[PDB]
Design a protein around this ligand. Sequence first.
Ligand SMILES: NC(=O)c1ccc[n+]([C@@H]2O[C@H](COP(=O)([O-])OP(=O)(O)OC[C@H]3O[C@@H](n4cnc5c(N)ncnc54)[C@H](OP(=O)(O)O)[C@@H]3O)[C@@H](O)[C@H]2O)c1
Ligand SMILES: NC(=O)c1ccc[n+]([C@@H]2O[C@H](COP(=O)([O-])OP(=O)(O)OC[C@H]3O[C@@H](n4cnc5c(N)ncnc54)[C@H](OP(=O)(O)O)[C@@H]3O)[C@@H](O)[C@H]2O)c1
Lengths: 289, 290
Amino acid sequence: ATPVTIIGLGAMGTALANAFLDAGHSTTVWNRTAARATALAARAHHAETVTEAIAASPLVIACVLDYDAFHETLAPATDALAGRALVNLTTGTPKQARETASWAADHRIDYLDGKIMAIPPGIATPDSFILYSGPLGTFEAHRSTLEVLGAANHVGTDAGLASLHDIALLTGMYGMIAGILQAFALIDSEGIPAGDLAPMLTNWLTGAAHSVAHYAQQIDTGDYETGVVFNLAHQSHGFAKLVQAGEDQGVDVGLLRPLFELMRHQVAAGYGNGDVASVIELIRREERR
Amino acid sequence: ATPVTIIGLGAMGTALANAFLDAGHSTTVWNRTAARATALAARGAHHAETVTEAIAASPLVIACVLDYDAFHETLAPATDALAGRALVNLTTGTPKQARETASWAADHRIDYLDGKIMAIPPGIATPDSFILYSGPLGTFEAHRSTLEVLGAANHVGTDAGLASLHDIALLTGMYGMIAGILQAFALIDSEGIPAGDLAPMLTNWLTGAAHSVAHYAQQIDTGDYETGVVFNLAHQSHGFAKLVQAGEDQGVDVGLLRPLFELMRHQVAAGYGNGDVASVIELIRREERR
Ligand SMILES: NC(=O)c1ccc[n+]([C@@H]2O[C@H](COP(=O)([O-])OP(=O)(O)OC[C@H]3O[C@@H](n4cnc5c(N)ncnc54)[C@H](OP(=O)(O)O)[C@@H]3O)[C@@H](O)[C@H]2O)c1
Ligand SMILES: NC(=O)c1ccc[n+]([C@@H]2O[C@H](COP(=O)([O-])OP(=O)(O)OC[C@H]3O[C@@H](n4cnc5c(N)ncnc54)[C@H](OP(=O)(O)O)[C@@H]3O)[C@@H](O)[C@H]2O)c1
């Protein structure tokens, strides 16, 4: 029954507000532009300033463009934030997440840094989950409430950890996106619709997604050799056909050159009998090699 | 059961020979290094000393060597030996290689078929295995049921280069995913988190991601990058920027993602910022298709 307050009513903010009203939470809303709050008020208290939105709820959820937008909005109202739960679901770096979290510990604000792994329509469906990092007490207080938005997964007390997980998950997805676009550009070079390849490509990538754990185990033991089916020397040999075909077809293949480069270096450095995961030794933190 | 000849008995070629043996075909084998032929002879394969004897044994010949150069170096002397036969080439190569091979074949009365294995040797003749074929439909039709010993058989068109094109497209999707996986682990590793600690979440995330493929295919084929946009490209470009800043904050190389990032920024600068990331295809697709 927890009253909640939403700061920022963009596409993501609007979905959060709407999901709470559905679950029956006394919802207060606020936005830098009053228009966006209008439909919400029809179905929610539209507070006229940041402090009114803040003061109405023990839980304050902020969700604006970037962190610079996060300061200017809420930095004047620290004292109104004192003794409240402030959940900041704004995209940014781990460094930003930890700076903001110590700032929030100075002014007695129970800070939680969160990152939505969902698209606005997906809120309040089993497809949404949000990662939170920061004090386990703050999080555990509002969990059932936050479970309105979707799954709530606390990933650590280090405040930047949700941000790190978020960036890691998006780098995963973006890598796949570049693969997909490159695959489509290749098949497009002979006039085939993307739609003709989509079902096969979806199945292929779904199976490929099961090697994640394979790579993890290789990275965690440092053994890139045990259980390799098609080794790196062979992958690098064949990968070169992917690049030469691409330019035979008039298709740019620069999206794949960086990984290819790393693979070829690890082959030349002696890792050709192991798996492609050994590439990680060229891009991980130096201290961890 | 049609007799079959396997030319090339490395890991994959040995798997094909074993599948045909297990299915009861009379299987003749040949490898540049005799040792690998001797291993299959132990199982009942007919070990042929030369490529011509092996080819002469069978109406259907399946080559599976390292690359199209080995294929050419091996089968060109035996060109005449191959007249009147079906030749199925499962070697990885480019569409240009498949098409030039299919021209050489059709010039010398060789029934040619170019195929590509989407499987690893353990997967052959299991339900996970499929092979794409392209080239003359007649060859594919006469020998399809034999080829199904190896796994599913999908003829993807008469342009002999099309199996190779399909194979490369799929490997390209997979390797971009691999680049993303390794980048994600390198980032999570920067705080000493075990890769295995992220792997379940990463796997579930990317299996969900994989079902976005149809969406991007819809945007590419309709040429409409703007309808169906939740989070536009100009915002993604913003987010991507922080994603790269975090990597250097954490001491992790983020070079795997810079080429995509550059295409994204170029598209925002050209005025596509209200569309989706799929519009990046305009910058890499063949000029005639833009
Ligand atoms: N949308 C998604 O798919 C999605 C998914 C996961 C995470 N996120 C994250 O959630 C956050 C919200 O993004 P969104 O897509 O909802 O972005 P959006 O549609 O741009 O909304 C951003 C919010 O930022 C406010 N804003 C922008 N500049 C501001 C400033 N300079 N000072 C104060 N407020 C400002 C806006 O209010 P005005 O409109 O009044 O300017 C707006 O309500 C982002 O960090 C995004 O990365 C979004
Ligand atoms: N997971 C897989 O293994 C897999 C999956 C899909 C596709 N493929 C494709 O299948 C093909 C074969 O791969 P593989 O894993 O079986 O590779 P492999 O185990 O390295 O065996 C390569 C084969 O090529 C032969 N070869 C190499 N150079 C040659 C030459 N110059 N003249 C004649 N024969 C030559 C080898 O003979 P020697 O024994 O005398 O070296 C051997 O028979 C590759 O193009 C690969 O891309 C493999």
